[PDB]
Amino acid sequence: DLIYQDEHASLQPLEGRTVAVIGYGIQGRAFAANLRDSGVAVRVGNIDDRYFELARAEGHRVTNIAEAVAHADIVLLLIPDEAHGAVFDVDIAPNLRDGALLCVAHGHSLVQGDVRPLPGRDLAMLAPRMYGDPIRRYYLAGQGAPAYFDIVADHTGRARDRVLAIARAVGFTRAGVMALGYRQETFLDLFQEQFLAPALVDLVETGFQVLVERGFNPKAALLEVYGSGEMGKMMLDGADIGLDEVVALQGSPTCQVGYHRWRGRTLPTAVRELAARVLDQIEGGDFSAYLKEQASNDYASLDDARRAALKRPLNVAHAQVRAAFRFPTEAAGGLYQAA
Amino acid sequence: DLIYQDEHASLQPLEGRTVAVIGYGIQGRAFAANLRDSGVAVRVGNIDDRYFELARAEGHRVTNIAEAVAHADIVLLLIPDEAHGAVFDVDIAPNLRDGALLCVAHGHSLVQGDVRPLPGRDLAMLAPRMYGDPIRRYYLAGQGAPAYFDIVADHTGRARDRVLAIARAVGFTRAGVMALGYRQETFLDLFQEQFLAPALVDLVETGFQVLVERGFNPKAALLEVYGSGEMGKMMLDGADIGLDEVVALQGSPTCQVGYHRWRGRTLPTAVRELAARVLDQIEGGDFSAYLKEQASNDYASLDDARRAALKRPLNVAHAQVRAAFRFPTEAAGGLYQAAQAPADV
Ligand SMILES: NC(=O)C1=CN([C@@H]2O[C@H](COP(=O)(O)OP(=O)(O)OC[C@H]3O[C@@H](n4cnc5c(N)ncnc54)[C@H](O)[C@@H]3O)[C@@H](O)[C@H]2O)C=CC1
Ligand SMILES: NC(=O)C1=CN([C@@H]2O[C@H](COP(=O)(O)OP(=O)(O)OC[C@H]3O[C@@H](n4cnc5c(N)ncnc54)[C@H](O)[C@@H]3O)[C@@H](O)[C@H]2O)C=CC1
Ligand SMILES: C[S+](C)CC/C(O)=C(/O)C(=O)O
Ligand SMILES: C[S+](C)CC/C(O)=C(/O)C(=O)O
Ligand SMILES: [Mg+2]
Ligand SMILES: [Mg+2]
Ligand SMILES: [Mg+2]
Ligand SMILES: [Mg+2]
């Protein structure tokens, strides 16, 4: 494996260059904020929506996407994946300067051919393994989250150092930036979203529902399965020292004996089988077809799913617990303004 | 529900009283540290092992258990649950002053009858919903983790305000301290440890195993299922705003569409049926009998299981990833030393 940390990257390739951040969403806002604080010239390209106004409110040079691209040496396409094709064809490809670098943060539009190499230009993936708020918070604490990168097309022969310069400016090299093919990244990322995340929340919810059914205090049931923060602390500490090691170090002997009674014994064969079926849906194009249908509406079906999830017993209990118990938080106002 | 925060508790009941922390392990160290920093007279009772020397290194007044109890108004029994019976019979019961309060941090020894009410004395549970390091880190940031409490025996009639005074001094009232019966706490706590924690790690491990079998880069597989910290951040942010809400707020539309394709649909009935089986084993005494067997030869079988778990593919991959990728950590050196705060803090 090729893994790049700060010792393996430099801001030198960004000297005298302008980065156009296309989109000012979860990733775009974090990239724009960290690039600016790292002393990189940055401008934002965005359509006429609330994100345009937010970028203006946070002191950025904001224009339509075509104008941002026409005035940029490096272009980061940080909008939803189903929107890449139309924005690439209409706004990006006609305005991308000779020798300019275009980056995506997910392989999906590359796999589908909605973003393609252009003669005379560079194309890459820099895919963070983290959502925006923590990328921003880590950055300000002198920390970073991991990322994967791939050099898809390199006309200039300088794409690798320019991609890794962006990665250093945004903080990912403080953890590590590993070479991984855009196709593998696509399938791996979608697998985490479609198998692991829903199975994890379904498992937490199953614990909650069995306890409430069996006559346990619903607030206490919600607190134990995640609401206390304990199970989240175990998973985040586990990223540092190992999940079994969190139990060995931090668990009472009562806890450790119970945990090891059931470790490797809790799940039916159906879980491993579902994992394989989800990968079949991803690798074979079935999920990509489903996503295209879901987007064809401005995501009307997703809006209905989001609203329905808030009515589930776990989420009704969440609101009751959160109103009754203070959770440790840090103030987020002004997080994305200039340091 | 009865939920106490800082405005429902005071340190007044600890004025002129001494707290004996019995044990200096995961909970004992956090209780002793937070009590000292809250200005409470605290001493540590411990056997002759490494924890005695750690308590001394960290600046505490340390003695054997009998001596600590004989000189205390409030006694916190923060040693492993299977050890409560012998220590209670030999060291605590003969030395507990008239009107003293004994507290446990888990209901198990009360359920088993290894710790019992004593004439003229108070007995309570104060059970943190968190392990020691976060209790300590939260305390130093002016924050706390939740706890459950129960008043089991109240000779004095002042047990409730003394238990909540301890909870305020240690930080739990900054989140909330809720009344919950010691028997319910026991079964609920053991259920989290025996169903939920191993099922969560088994699921992460299953994701890792299938990805490696299907030809994915093992470091990348390990990072996505937990190693990046992303899934832990989602669970911890989820504690604040809700788990479905984290996806709605922080997920790309691609992520949200994929998540909601399977949300509420991933698990067959065998999972909730196994959860009920674990609860049956807990409620009916089967786990309690297993625990007593396992505590034989000082938990020899658990030592074997711990060592064996380090060599599982997930943990071999963990070591490879953690050597290749830097993870954001905060320095832990001196975390449990006295923490004098400057004017700005
Ligand atoms: N959300 C995350 O934390 C991560 C996302 N990514 C990738 O980063 C990229 C950005 O995703 P997010 O930041 O989550 O998206 P988002 O949902 O936050 O995107 C909002 C932004 O997209 C723009 N936008 C939306 N529809 C548009 C359209 N039709 N035409 C032009 N602009 C449009 C909005 O104006 C706004 O600036 C995606 O390729 C995603 O897969 C990868 C790593 C993590
Ligand atoms: N570990 C945790 O974060 C939590 C633990 N608890 C409860 O807190 C209590 C303490 O558990 P932990 O701190 O995890 O235990 P631990 O494993 O850290 O206990 C170590 C301490 O116990 C003492 N000890 C061990 N065996 C002994 C014996 N035979 N006689 C006398 N002292 C002995 C040691 O000298 C040391 O002071 C238990 O009742 C546990 O259920 C409840 C909430 C969370
Ligand atoms: C990793 S956590 C579930 C261990 C800390 C905790 O809350 C307990 O009840 C215990 O250790 O017995
Ligand atoms: C809760 S996390 C898995 C969402 C952030 C993330 O890593 C993505 O790949 C995405 O949003 O598309
Ligand atoms: Mg991702
Ligand atoms: Mg426990
Ligand atoms: Mg517990
Ligand atoms: Mg994604």
Numbering used by the authors:
A (entry chain B): 3 to 341
B (entry chain A): 3 to 347
Copy the relevant paper text.
A trait of BP bacteria is a conserved gene cluster coding for the biosynthesis of polyketides (malleicyprols) with a reactive cyclopropanol unit that is critical for virulence. We show that BurG, an unusual NAD+-dependent member of the ketol-acid reductoisomerase family, constructs the strained cyclopropanol ring. A sequence similarity search using BLAST predicted that BurG belongs to the family of ketol-acid reductoisomerases (KARIs; EC 1.1.1.86), well-characterized enzymes that play key roles in the biosynthesis of branched-chain amino acids. Biochemical assays and a suite of eight crystal structures of native and mutated BurG with bound analogues and inhibitors provide snapshots of each step of the complex reaction mechanism, involving a concealed oxidoreduction and a C–S bond cleavage.
Apart from its function as a catalytic base, E232 also plays an active role in substrate recognition and positioning as we gleaned from crystallization assays with gonydiol and BurG. In one subset the active centre is populated by the enzymatic reaction products 6 and DMS. The second subset clearly depicts the backbone of gonydiol, which was oxidized into its enolate 14. Intermediate 14 is firmly held in place by ionic interaction of its sulfonium moiety with E232 and cation–π interaction with Y133. In addition, the glutamate residue (E232) would ionically interact with the positively charged sulfonium group to firmly position the substrate in the binding pocket. Inheritance of the redox capability of KARIs allows BurG to activate its substrate gonydiol as the electrophilic intermediate 14. This activation is vital for intramolecular electrophilic displacement of DMS as leaving group and subsequent cyclopropanol formation. In the case of BurG, formation of 6 is probably driven by a gain in entropy and removal of the volatile DMS from the chemical equilibrium after cyclopropanol synthesis.
